[PDB]
Symmetry: C3
Amino acid sequence: MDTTVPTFSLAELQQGLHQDEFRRCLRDKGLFYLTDCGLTDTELKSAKDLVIDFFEHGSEAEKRAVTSPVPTMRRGFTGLSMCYSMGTADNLFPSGDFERIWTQYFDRQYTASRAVAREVLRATGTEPDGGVEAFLDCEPLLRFRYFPQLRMAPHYDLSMVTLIQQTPCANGFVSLQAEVGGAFTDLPYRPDAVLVFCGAIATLVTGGQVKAPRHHVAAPIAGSSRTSSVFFLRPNADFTFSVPLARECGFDVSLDGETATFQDWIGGNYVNIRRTSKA
Amino acid sequence: MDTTVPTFSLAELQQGLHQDEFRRCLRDKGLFYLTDCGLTDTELKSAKDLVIDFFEHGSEAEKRAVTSPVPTMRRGFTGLSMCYSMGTADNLFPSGDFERIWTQYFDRQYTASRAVAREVLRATGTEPDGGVEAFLDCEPLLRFRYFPQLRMAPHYDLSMVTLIQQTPCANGFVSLQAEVGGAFTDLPYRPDAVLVFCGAIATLVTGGQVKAPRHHVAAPIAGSSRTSSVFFLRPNADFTFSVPLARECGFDVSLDGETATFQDWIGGNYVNIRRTSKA
Amino acid sequence: MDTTVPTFSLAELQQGLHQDEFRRCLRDKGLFYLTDCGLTDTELKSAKDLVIDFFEHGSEAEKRAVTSPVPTMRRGFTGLSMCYSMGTADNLFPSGDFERIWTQYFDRQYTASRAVAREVLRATGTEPDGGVEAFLDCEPLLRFRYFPQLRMAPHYDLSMVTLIQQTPCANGFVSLQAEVGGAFTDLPYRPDAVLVFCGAIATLVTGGQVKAPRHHVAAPIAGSSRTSSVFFLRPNADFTFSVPLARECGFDVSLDGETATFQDWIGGNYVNIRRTSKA
């Protein structure tokens, strides 16, 4: 097949265009670039610049004030590489300036993620139990990471969708790759577009109409540092689904009875990514 | 002790022979070869030949048609090495020929697995809650893997039993090993016998009368490619057991109250293997 | 900040001394050495000597008699390095001498662990749901390991507290390290003191007033063998907490409703340690 990662305009999708091409991409690939969704490069770099300044020039005291007592990377700063995490509430901000910039940036990513999920649901004829808007008013997590100078083994996402913005390596190396058509397909930076991965919850809610592709990080050198902004659109704990339907599209569930929740399936802590089994 | 992996005839066991030797093997070793159980080499190789042909000569389109939208290795094809998985239903078959051959092959493995589990239960005097036949009418999973030219760290199985058929390395290298008597004991191919590992559910249901041994894969070279057929006999989600009894034979359960289900213990997704703790 | 691991006298804490220093250590570091808590070096080495003799000179038969049928390291002997595990009951002892010595040793560690947890709770004004003494009458696990001649990647503990005694490397190498102030701070043997790590349950029960620090094992050579005694003070399955409060101090819970138990959060098997996410 064409092993090309396609691009869709969110605006065009919302106008009812390219519906067969979109459905085919969802089923056969489960990833695409998304343009016209409110996510500019100029904005990514104002958020990026202020967090890198913090990473670079924040003192340990300032960093501690925005570090959670458990190192879960749910909110605030994590040093390991460095991460900054946020969600809809319970956020930890270094300063008023930072807060304004990152609140806006989060909001725009949450709006885009809901909007593309709405289009995934609509294109596949899917009405989640409890309706679309209650499904999308959910439990998102944003993680921004700086990586200094394959590096990560393949995994699939357990989100509904995952939105990824990157900055490129100064030396032009492309670190992110996904399985497409059996192949390793590069996923380069695009100043004009966000990368969308469908996750296993898209597969589940749509009754198997959406693929959750595996992806990894390649290793390359001088100028290979990079950043990423990873936005997970994750369902509420009480998201409810059919157990027999789950079994029909590949989920190896150990669930008694006919319906179950997300919490029943995953447990009491969110799990964002998953590897293939070695057994 | 004798660090020898013993062999039992299923037919002989069913006639009530070797009962003390069987009980001792179960308690002290928890693994054995099993003959006279309906599983021929000729049959393994008809199933093997048709899946290898598929792996080798199936196009990407044919492979996609039998690939689940989530890469769980529960059903159909997985490319990583390559795997073909099946169970009692919701299977994905490349062709009528394949389907006939693999349905028969699965059935024979499920029958053998139930039959040897029945003998484990009988030899240990065990009546599962809800009775033997409801316990054995369960949630099996078969995985056939091709491996091209230790490779895997030790784990124990969480099945009732696991049945393993292999094809040998052309160069005679023996890749599978298990802990026996504190030793690393080779587990070579036997054209005439299937390898049986007892899993943690055998330990649990029998109140600690069956060992769940650790095993691994050794690395060796030219002619070290191999295949395996791994059949997990896994309980139903609602399999129920005593919590205090579980605690008595080594299970580090965090379960309130006096009884629990398999789902309570393991969660909402099957887990097939488990490593020892590093903490 | 001072990246020094502080030391507290349990006796002094119980007299109401150093309360602001203790609270600051708990919030900012979440680890300390503890003196005057009933844990002598002389006693560590009587328990150590008798288990090392067993490890060294116990035959396979003797070892098998105190090995659980599942290799969970919950109770008795595990060979991998070698481990000896115990708890309040269901223990497996090689001999009357061993049993007397290790029962006393366990008891003293459980008493110290409860006592320092009581002081953590008191210093932070915390009344667990169901009260202090029911919270501390819990599910401890002791693991003693021998290691022959970083070796382990960073993790945090999921205990209330974890108490660690060590013996030193003959060559003086210091293998244990923790994150303090962003730094790698050595955690050497002290004949006079036990090392206390706060775990995530301390963070949870106190509403985020206690840090759960990450720690690891460094690799060095001749004379680098070592032992450790690791005592996990773990809550009961029915330990109950506020879900919104959990979310406020960093826990990425997927729990419906307003309250939850430890079992709801962690599942049906204890999990003792946890790594930071790579997603």
